[PDB]
Each structure stands twice: as C-alpha cells, then as structure tokens.
C-alpha cells in the first residue's frame, strides 16, 4: 500500500519533467498495480515482446506529446541493437527499487546520499554493502563515497590515495610480471561508477600525478623520476628532471610516499620492479659513467648507481689510491652500509670496509711508505705495538671485505687485488725488510743480548708463573696451548672487545723465543724450572725433561705441577658436571689448539692463508668460555708460539734472499729460519746466539734471513715464520682475563657449567646437610648463568628433599679453596634401593626436571656422629 | 538555453553563407563536408534548432529535410534484415546465413536511400532532425564515409552527440574507435571562436 503511494510519488517526480520514464523490474516489484497508478497521460510499455525499433519510433516519432512508462523483467536489450540507448541515457528511470536495504547495509541511512547511491544502483551486493559498512563514517559525502567505493574495490581498509596506490602498485608489480589484471579490472570497475575519473583526479589532489591518458606504468615512470631526480647526480641532474610527476606538490607527496615506501617495509616491495624498469629507458648510468663516487652516499636509487660508485672506486684503486683521498674515502662508507640496497644485501655493506680497511692500509702505507724505521729494537718494538701490525689487520680485513662483496661470485673489483698484493709482496714486506736489518746491524743483538725495558720469554714458569701468586687468591689457571698466530689476532680479539666488562685487559706485550716456530714457543711455557732441548726429538722439544708432543707425554709434563692435558679434538666444550672433579689438585691444566697451523704446513692452504684470515678469523675474535665471574674462574692462559705472514701473489725478490752455511746441529730448518750452533750475521741473513736468548739447554746460534727474505719452503712460502721480527716474534703478554668463544668450540655436547657437590656420590648423612657445590667452572660465552633449582629426586623427577634456589658472582682462585655449602633438608630412607636417585638441578628459569647427577641416601641420623 | 551550443548551431547558418562551406575550400577540389560534435544530452536543442533551421535557411539557400531515426524505421522494424536474411540457408548453406544474421549493417550502403529522398547534388545542403537517436548500428564517421558515394561535392555536417577531439569521434557514454577528416570543423570544441555570443 505505502510502497504504491511512494511508487506513485516517485513516478510523478519523474513524469513531472521527463515525458518518458524507464522502470526495469527483474524483481517484478509492482506487477499487479499497473492500473491503480494516478498518472496524467502515461502509457505503460512492457518493452520485452516489442519491436524495440518500432516502439522507440512510438515513443519519439509517432507520439511526441505522449508520456510513457517502460517496463522489462530484465535490464536493457543488447547494446549493439539497443535502438533506445540514447533515450535510456538522456532520460530517467522510476526507482521501483528500495534504497533502505542498501543504505542500512552500508550503515549509511542517509536519504540524501541515497540519490548518489541510486546513481550507483549497479554496484551493490550484501558483501560490498557490509564491507563498506565496515568502512563507513556516516558524515559521508559523494566524494568520500567515491573514495571509499574505490577503497572497497581496492581491498584496503582506509581510503587514501597513497595506500590505494600501494595496493594498485602491488597489482601493477603483479600485472608487469606474474599473470594479473585486477589493477585494470579495478580501474574498469572504478570507471563503471565514474570513480576512475575520481581516482586519477585525487591522484592530483593527493599524489600530484596527472596524464591525458594515464596508466600505473606512466605514474610509476613519473613518480620514479621524482625521487630519481631528488637523488640525481648533482653533476648531471637536469637531463633526468624532465620525465617527473605532474606537480611539485606531487613530487613532495612522492618523496614522502617513497620515504614511506623505504621506511615502512610493508611497501618496499614495489622496488622489486622499479629497479628493473628503470635502466633501459635511457641507460642514464652509462650517461653518468665517470661522475664522482664518494658524494653518492646520498643516493640509493638503483643497482646501477651502486655499481657506478663501485666501478668509479675500482677505478680509484686500479689507479690505486695508495696516496689516499681520505675524507672522500670515508664520506661514503657507513652511509652505504646503512642505505637500502646495503641493508638488503650485506656483500654491498662489505664494499664499505673493503674501503674502510683499505682506508687503513693505504693511510698506513702512506705514513710508512718506505717500510718503517726506528732507532733500535726497543723503539721499533714501541712503534710496532702502537701500529705496525695494523698493516696486517687492514690488508687482511679489506681483502676479506672485498671478497665479502665478492661472496656471491660478484668479482666486480678483481684486479686491484693484484695492485694491493703487489704492495704486500713487492713493497710493504719488501722495504722494512732492510730497515730493521739496519737496526740489527746497529745493535748486533745476535750475541749482544739486552734490549731496553721489554720482557723476554726465556724463563717463564721458572721466574714468572708461580710469582703471579702476589695476590692472595692465586695458585693456578687453565691453559689453552696454540699453534701458529700472526700477532694481530691478539690485538683484534681484544681491541674489538674494549667494549667488555670484567671480561678485561691492558695494552702490553713482550719478546718471544727468537726462532719463530710452534714447539720452541711451547718449550719455554711447558711448566718448568728448566727448559730442555734433547737429542732424538729434533724439532720436538721439552721442559723439566717432559715433551711438547704425543698425548701420554703431553698430559704427563704437567703432573710435576699436579696437571693433565686435552686435545683440540676434545677441549671444545668438554663434558658437563663431572668437570668439578677430574682436576682438583692440578696447579697446571692444558688444552691443545691448532686451526691456523693446520692451514700452514698443510702446504695446499699456505697460498690460502687469506682463507685462514677467513676460517680461523671466524674462530679467533672469540675463544674463551668458562671464566667470567660466577662459579669461580680467573685469567687468560694462551700466548703466541709464533707469528706468520700472508701475501696474495707469488713472491718478490725481497721475499727470498737466503741462507749462509746451514748449521750441523740443525734443531729445525724452515721456510724462514734454521736453529743451530755458531752463526754471526750476513748481508741478508740475521745470525746470532740462541744460547744467549733462549734460556733452553741449547748451544745454538740461528740462521734467519735479514729482512723479508726467506729459506727452504717447508710448509709455506707466501705464508712463512721463523725469523727475527714482529709478524713472527711479537708475543701477546697483553694483560688479559676472558673473551667471546667460537674458536675451538664444535664437537662435545655443551658442558653447561659444572656445578654440583664436594662429595663421592652426592650422598649426605647429617639430618640437614651440605650440598657443597665446588665453584670451579663459570659461565663465560657458552657455559651457563642459569639459576639452579636444586633438589633430590627419583628417576622421574619426584621430590625426596627440600629445595634450594642458587646463583653466583665470583672469579676467585686456587681450586682447593672454593666450596659452597648449599645445605639441603633430607627425608630419612624413602629412597627405593632397587632404583636410581638423583639431585635435580632445574634450570630455575624454566623449572623442568632439567638436569640431574647421582644420589642415594638412607640416613645414619645425627646422633651417630655426635 | 546553452549559449555555446546555440552559438555553434547559429554558425551552421554562418558557415553556410560564408565562402568555405559551399565552395568546399579546405582545398576546394574536395567534397565540402563538415564536423559538429555537441554535448550528448543537448538532443532537444539540436533537433529543435534544425526543425527551426528548415524554416529559416530558405531565406538564404536551397535544401531538403531528413529524420535520422525515420530513415531506419522506413526500412526496418526490429533487426528486420536479420529476419529476412534467414532465407540464405538453402542457397549456400548455414555459413553465409549465420555470418549475415550475426554481422549486421555494413555501413557503406547507407548512401542511396537519402539520394532517393533528396536530390543531394542539386541542393546546397540537407537539414536533419531526430539527431542523437543514433544507437542502432549507424555511426557518425561511417555515415560521413557512406554518403560521399551520392552527395557529390555537396556538403554534409556530422552532428554527433558527444565529442570529436579534432581526431577521435565518440558519442554518448564513450563508444567507437575511429576518426573523420575530409570534413572541416564547423566550429571546434574550444577557444573564444567556440563561444562568440557575449553581453
């Protein structure tokens, strides 16, 4: 009834000003009431069965004053034959359809915006209506309805052109690569409701984009060109300024939008295609070519910008900037490491220390470009321990960083390796060679054995080790014993831990055994009152008559000081809570250690000692565990047996001037030395009294090449060790106590500290009794800080004692000195004697039945003792 | 009134009595056709103006009358030739039949019946009515391609309900993908030359 009153009023409102009114009726909304209709003149035309040509003719030609109400049970007839379409467009429809369902299913109840929603009649289904209700904010207007109807087609849940664009640009990145068209199906569905006009309109109102015939391809050109222009080459901007966004306010939007696209890693993703689009359009990188590299710290636009700066600096290093462009050399580095492509791809970050550590090496080279010179061995040593190993570090580092740019096969720099290596073989090594010869020529320390101030290796356990008992805690610390170490490990490992706490050190160093190979370094440190060379061992050695090699001998050297030893096969994280017990007298305890020596006399890896500067370096910024203040542990005990070299090419002339008469008692002969009796120096051999300098039971002199010259290449030639100087005999008596373990770490399970007892079995006999936790092995950098929830259990973690919650903060010395009585409360004889029982130490921070060690109790109660 | 379309419509009579129209002076040695894209909903204004122009222009020049939808109605009542070309089946089989039922009104042949209605070459022009009723299969640039078979050198004017960008013709809500160029712009879309009735 009232639907008919409003049908009458709606038809009256159409027929007041249009002679012809449509009414499509697939819903058949007023099928019965057709003649109840009050209209002056109006003729209903059910068009469905009509000759629609002859009824257009009826409407237009035949009856030019007659009013008409057209009807169908479907939409228009096919548009190719829709004679009526021009009328259908310029005229009007009576809405037999009801807006209220749509309005309230949008939320939007609004009987005004109803007329635009009526202009959107073909948009609607319950899904879109209610999704739009999910987005509606009923102070809507036609433009917000438009923007939101865009947003509704676009799948976002806020209606803003940047975010819409982010969606559409997702759909563009799809459409450009991976079998999609819902960008253009969205655009077409926008156009279906006039909204695509509103899209490319509000792309001016918000994004300052226009074109006469726009596409997301053209916008992506114009907008790429914006931040491309803002980051363009300052030497070559203008020729790339001319393909940009339609307005500078759009450029500003586009910069804030591209700053967003960078920062908000939601939408980084569209640079998965811009950097592919944006070369072959103009090849502007090939137009830029020789533009300044270090200034481009600013610009992150493409792979090509980056590769410009690469090749512009590869240029500067085949032009081979020994003479150093220092502050421009710096200008780029950290900025690139922090900038987008670097942040995507670490090998690019490596470029900037392939730079930074060459920036070292060539600054270093410049300041010491004739090699180095100082007045005597003490003043050369003084300068060495400031700096004159940093030329190892820097070369090593930057080559490995260059090679870390190259990590993915990107050899995008290669041949300047051959320049900088020629610095090595043919200059760096080549020169100071001669220079510290002129000092040993000045001094003849050969058989003139004193040097100002600096300490000596020749009597260490006899006159230093037990003299470390000057603080009342001290009698003992654990040793790691290592083969081959270019001294700068023992500056990088410590200086790159100047950041650490009571994990601590002091800048100090001292002079080693003069023949630089492993086992004579070992002998002077084998625990002793005297150091032994003896016949039958040759290049194997002793102290107190016990020897540097063979496992049974190796644990036995130490028994004179209660000790024992363990392999590099075993130390690594050598077995858990039993570590409290196997050791408790041992004034000395040993671990063997060998990664770089296993690259050395392994002659296939001598040419690969830059790969020791990789594989061993990934172990050697690291080392310790088992020491920092907790379950009591105290000091460093490792130091250099010998230094060594590396160089990236076949040798110079200065790399191999050679021997005089080799000694008959050759104790070892080697790639860079010989030990043996009666040898004073020569033009390119240093030769002097090992018997003065070594403190070992040894008559010898030495043969050493003066300068970077060399001998019989046993186990190396580009890697060598043996002779007089500090990439061979700087020994790191840095004051040290603990570090950052990864060296010598792999094979055993974990040893998560050790903790329990000071008892045979964990067996207790007082009515309340001491679990005497013998503090012996802390945390450190693999072993545990874990709070201990200590209680006795059966096999299945079921309680049979009181429980204690335990943690520590101590580093105290002398292994006999260190009990903690965690006094547990005990339950008679509940223990089933056919079954095993244990002290659970929970990880008190996760409280599982985490770990346990063996207990049996059946109390002889207190009165049996007292 | 829209004064811009009323001005452009008054320039039908101005171009007709100016030299270029009846002398065909684009190059002169040409069929002197002309172009008149107009705002698509202004049907009534163009129809009624040309119903008036049939009464007014005989003060100046010689012509006759056409009605756009009447010319179609005079030969069809529905797809019509569809219903008639159903006869093709026995003659050559179902291929020609189906292609002639589906692929309707090839526009070349629109020419002759207007030359039977009006002596086109003897007129200075012909005036249309019903105008933007264009949505059968007849298209503006196609009608302008067809009638040059029979108009001779006599001018024809492409009244079209929509736009012609100086190249792309399009009616109504945006249709067709085609151009016309032998015809001169009677008055273009744009500039003060498109709007010369100030106060």
Residue numbers in the entry:
A (entry chain C): 2 to 867
B (entry chain A): 3 to 201
Recite the paper's sentences.
Large scale co-expression and co-purification of His-SUMO-BrxB and PglZ yielded a clean sample of native PglZ:BrxB sub-complexes. The Salmonella PglZ:BrxB sub-complexes were used to perform structural studies through negative stain transmission electron microscopy, followed by cryo-EM. The final model displayed a GSFSC resolution of 4.45 Å, but the features of the resulting map, while clearly indicating the presence of a protein volume and dimensions consistent with a PglZ:BrxB complex, did not provide clearly defined features corresponding to individual secondary structural elements, likely caused by the influence of very strong preferred orientation of the particles, with a corresponding cFAR value reported by orientation diagnostics in CryoSPARC of 0.04. BrxB is itself predicted with high confidence to form a globular protein fold, and further predicted to interact with the N-terminal domain (residues 1–96) of PglZ. Examination of the model using EMBL PISA identified Salmonella BrxB residues R49, N135 and W137, and PglZ residues K58, E62 and D88, as forming the core of the predicted protein–protein interface (inset). The remainder of the PglZ protein is predicted to assume an ‘S’ shape, similar to observed particles from the EM analyses with a central domain (residues 98–292) and a large C-terminal domain (residues 304–748) that contains the metal-binding site identified within PorX, and a final extension including a seven sheet β-barrel (residues 749–867). However, the orientations of those two modelled regions, relative to one another, differ significantly when comparing the same independent AlphaFold3 predictions, consistent with a possible flexible hinge point in the protein backbone located between residues 96 and 99 of PglZ. Collectively, our mutational analysis of the PglZ:BrxB interface supports our hybrid cryo-EM and AlphaFold3 model. Alternatively, and due to the observed data in Salmonella and E. coli, we postulate that the role of BrxB might be as a scaffold protein, participating within and allowing connections between multiple BREX components within higher order complexes.
BREX (Bacteriophage Exclusion) systems, identified through shared identity with Pgl (Phage Growth Limitation) systems, are a widespread, highly diverse group of phage defence systems found throughout bacteria and archaea. The varied BREX Types harbour multiple protein subunits (between four and eight) and all encode a conserved putative phosphatase, PglZ, and an equally conserved, putative ATPase, BrxC. In this study, we identified a stable BREX sub-complex of PglZ:BrxB, generated and validated a structural model of that protein complex, and assessed the biochemical activity of PglZ from BREX, revealing it to be a metal-dependent nuclease. PglZ can cleave cyclic oligonucleotides, linear oligonucleotides, plasmid DNA and both non-modified and modified linear phage genomes.
